């Protein structure tokens with residue numbers, strides 16, 4: 001019966017020669033939670049997963065599973081199970097069971113198979129699996145060992161959108177049930193928001209932020225994070241903090257007394273507002289800000305209508321629900337939800353919000 | 354100066370041995386329009402593009418460019434330019450100019466470069482192109498020839514989301530300007546809805562439907578099309594046409610006097626309603642239909658909240674704008690926009706709407 005093991009990553013560093021793949025990573029994965037390591041290629045997420053698995057040792061640092069320092073133990077002694085990417089399903093799931101009693105194997109395979117709802121496909125073969133999913137079999141074999149830490153690396157990279165989504169839900173629910181500490185690696189910001197109880201955004205080997213999808217989405221602490229989750233991406237416009245307003249390359253926004261930019265008056269900061277936190281008059285937000293402009297391009301995707309409006313010299317994207325194929329050239333009155341606005345220091349790109 | 358050439362595909366068939374890649378395709382691409390051939394892998398879209406280019410001959414059929422039968426002419430005599438996937442930009446774009454006068458080349462390169470807004474990168478090299486996009490150079494070289502028919506095959510397959518979108522707009526506007534007949538191939542339904550003036554949905558070598566993004570989206574003539582454009586996919590539930598209502602595996606929907614199913618009373622048809630055409634009480638549609646159910650899973654993507662609600666034995670997806678992380682288990686009252694409902698015959702999967 002699966003346990004809820006807390007995992008600690010202390011001052012973890014990994015560098016191949018001169019290149020630092022992971023720089024002083026300090027992270028505490030809460031026992032039984034589903035943590036996701038989101039980030040672009042080369043950010044260090046995969047190298048961090050491998051070190052946790054034991055397939056790769058740290059250049060410096062320590063790794064804990066519960067109170068045990070597992071930093072220097074073989075991947076086999078860490079009670080873990082990796083999940084990436086001629087026999088029968090039963091055999092496929094029993095495989096990982098490695099000096100194991102048959103009487104025990106049958107109980108585990110029945111257990112796993114039932115959790116992945118594939119008990120009925122047990123006596124079938126791979127290419128024959130037309131009554132289920134070879135995917136679900138892969139997971140069952142993953143949990144059949146009853147690991148303390150479940151590790152996954154872009155497990156749904158090659159799946160048709162529709163199916164993939166189904167697996168996101170399949171996996172998340174299973175984990176919510178087993179309550180097994182899971183660390184999930186992926187570059188897909190949508191998939192991260194769907195599965196992680198908390199998400200750890202990475203870049204250039206560093207941990208930029210960690211928290212619930214709600215926190216990293218509504219309150220990102222920097223430009224990178226603010227733009228890596230949520231698409232269309234958040235609009236970032238360069239501006240100058242005047243009195244109680246902001247001036248852009250051809251526009252201004254009245255800043256209600258907010259104005260936590262008192263230390264940036266006369267200086268330049270980064271304005272931020274998501275396409276979904278804007279709209280157009282003639283289509284309720286407590287406080288708002290207006291700016292008129294002409295539509296430069298429209299993305300009538302049927303289920304959404306993304307507009308490319310020209311704010312002075314700048315160009316931003318506005319997201320409207322449904323199919324609203326307005327035509328380019330026409331002028332619209334953009335309405336900004338002042339409560340969803342963000343402001344980042346231009347140098348440290350750190351939020352000031 | 355580019356011309357507006359109408360392209361006709363008459364009873365086009367292409368079969369490698371016993372396999373039919375394209376079955377009796379009849380299509381009329383309107384001069385100067387941007388037509389998109391959307392469809393999954395193996396549908397025949399690419400083989401149709403190649404036959405148009407002349408790189409591949411038909412097994413039967415005829416192809417017209419204007420009043421000229423170009424079916425059996427070398428790709429070079431068809432005045433076309435393909436676009437798929439050490440020199441200087443100027444050189445790169447001049448390359449296609451193949452017995453050409455320099456005095457003429459300079460005018461064309463200047464022309465193209467200006468249209469792709471890359472005149473300032475002309476004396477630069479590929480890997481050095483840090484001030485623009487090697488992508489824009491590719492297109493400029495494509496139009497530099499001044500083709501009658503512009504052909505493109507998944508040109509943006511390997512581009513980071515953000516960039517890709519920029520190219521969709523870049524390309525579409527350029528074409529809207531040049532008014533050159535363009536046939537665009539892609540499996541991306543979103544990209545299709547963004548660029549095609551009309552879209553031709555294909556599958557198993559057949560043309561299922563053609564029309565504006567608005568038409569194929571709001572009024573698809575079959576299950577396939579109705580589910581291939583718009584994601585999350587349209588919900589399809591099997592039902593029986595009673596009096597003025599529909600009965601599902603655990604639910605019913607009052608059908609206002611609609612009811613064009615008079616010939617399906619007592620029979621079974623396919624109910625259809627998109628996730629974006631539904632909602633939840635407590636969050637205006639002229640006519641509606643209700644059904645209560647419990648949330649099975651939630652996709653809080655920040656910019657959208659996709660719910661997986663259990664309608665009786667069936668499970669459907671509802672799309673709500675914004676971040677509304679409701680919790681699983683809770684029961685919601687789903688509201689269906691009766692005006693966005695579709696009904697397809699269960700056998701021919703052809704719409705009855």
Ligand SMILES: Nc1ncnc2c1ncn2[C@@H]1O[C@H](COP(=O)(O)OP(=O)(O)OP(=O)(O)O)[C@@H](O)[C@H]1O
Pocket residue numbers: 016019021039040041042043044045046047048
């Ligand atoms: N053996 C190695 N030698 C040199 N550099 C390496 C080695 N392994 C990984 N790297 C570097 O690590 C980074 C990849 O990080 P990982 O943490 O591997 O990235 P992802 O997981 O972000 O990317 P990927 O999907 O390619 O693994 C790259 O910047 C790459 O150059």
Ligand SMILES: Nc1ncnc2c1ncn2[C@@H]1O[C@H](COP(=O)(O)OP(=O)(O)OP(=O)(O)O)[C@@H](O)[C@H]1O
Pocket residue numbers: 369372374392393394395396397398399400401
């Ligand atoms: N030379 C060939 N010999 C046998 N089959 C072929 C050949 N060329 C294409 N096909 C078949 O054509 C179909 C691919 O259609 P195309 O019209 O090529 O598809 P897509 O454009 O839908 O897919 P792809 O991206 O692979 O080209 C497949 O069903 C494939 O088996």
